[PDB]
Design a protein around this nucleic acid. Sequence first.
DNA 1: CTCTACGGATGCCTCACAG
DNA 2: CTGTGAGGCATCCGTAGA
Length: 535
Amino acid sequence: DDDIESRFFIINDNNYNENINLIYKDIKYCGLNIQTTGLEVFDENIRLIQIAVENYPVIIYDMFNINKKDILDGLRKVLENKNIIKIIQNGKFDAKFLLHNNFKIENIFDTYIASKLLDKNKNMQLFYAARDSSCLLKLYKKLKEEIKKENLHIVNDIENKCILPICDMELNGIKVDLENLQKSTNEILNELNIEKDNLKKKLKDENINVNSQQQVLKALQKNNVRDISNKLIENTSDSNLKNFLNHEEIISLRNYRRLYKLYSAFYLKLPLHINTKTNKIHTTFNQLKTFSGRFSSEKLQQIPRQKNIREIFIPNDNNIFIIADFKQIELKIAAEDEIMLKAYNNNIDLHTLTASIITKKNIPDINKEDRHIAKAINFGLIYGMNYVNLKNYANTYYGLNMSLDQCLYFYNSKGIYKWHNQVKQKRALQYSTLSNRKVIFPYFSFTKALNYPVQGTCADILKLALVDLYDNLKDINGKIILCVHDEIIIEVNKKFQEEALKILVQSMENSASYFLKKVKCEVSVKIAENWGSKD
DNA sequence: CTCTACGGATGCCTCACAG
DNA sequence: CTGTGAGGCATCCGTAGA
């Protein structure tokens, strides 16, 4: 009860008709799907291969009943032909299987990524193999209206060109040094036992459960732990613990807790998710499961940035990491405010600027603490917080001893004013980025309206940089390793180091050039043998 | 508007057991 | 012969802890 091609040819050793390859002559695109025996590319086999050519029954290669390599020759040609688009559903899975089975492939259109982009993160056997192979032709036709027709053109085309870089990143993985891992685990464990012993001595109770909040609270009350104001401790929250630093017990307790979360929540949890036959971890990246459109990962961005932890990630033998970052990509995206644009054009830092406005100092007299405070003020107020919320956010995440009257002065102290007033007045629910990626709110939130275009444009820029990088790296067999925040990490042989550095820089600069017309980005790049070298 | 893990705390649910 | 405290886990839940 539809118009999806449901007839098919079946290819085996007994009926192989060479003339079938004449269907491949002068085609531009075709729907491609496969059927496998399971989910693990290393443990499973390809049961079927489906190729749907327009107006023809699907050519189905029965791989469990094919043993002459010649039968797949014309197939390999289609796969190798850089001028034939392969339309696929779940392109990573099929490409993974084809690569593991020594098939080369290039030019892919994954209809699932495009459909997920039509959704804008709103979250609203042979006959089957034939209809699923041939439906791709019509998805290709319609989803490619939703290329050039839509202005969602830009993002749909770029994510679609980004399909291959994402497969590259997940398939290359990143190698883990288990030595330093278990080592640091034993270290933090010995520090934890030192904490436990020295604190149960400090708690005047050797049998108290240091992991039981009630027992620790009772011991502290018994120990009569009081602050400078002689007030007995009432709760064990770290914020309250900050008020009792005059006692060595709060010292040791906060220490043991920090080391405990570090050890159990990380040193003890991390080994539970690793691959073995390759000693590589292959995490799962979600493309469109965040509100902004940034990448997410599961089973890398929640990994601590401290060099103590990031030193565990190393390149393969004879290779080296190349790490690149955008310098303040979000704020430049926001600028793209007259004062702000002129400052950016004079290469004046936005946080130094805000520090000079709050403190009334001149830019040469602004110190790092001034810039840190200005950073917190900028991220809090630019994204729509009020001074009460600002005080709490600042003290919580930046550890600042500001007063309510101060944050209120900060709040009260032309482009940004106009844009904020426009957002307040319109109270709109639909917003878009410079790629014209779009979102519709369930209700109006000033702060989410301010936050969405910046992060979504950052996502667009990084993804286009990954697309250019993936195309530019083939010549030197470059490997895409990682993308976090506004930074990318690649792994390359050491002899192409500086060349890949330029490729990476030009991959990111051209991407920035596609979106920013009034401001120039800055790329910080380093050559490293570990991920901790950047820090 | 949360989420996650974690132990401690509830909270019934059910089975061997001694009267 | 048969209700029953006990135990015996089995999860659910609070709050950190983000």
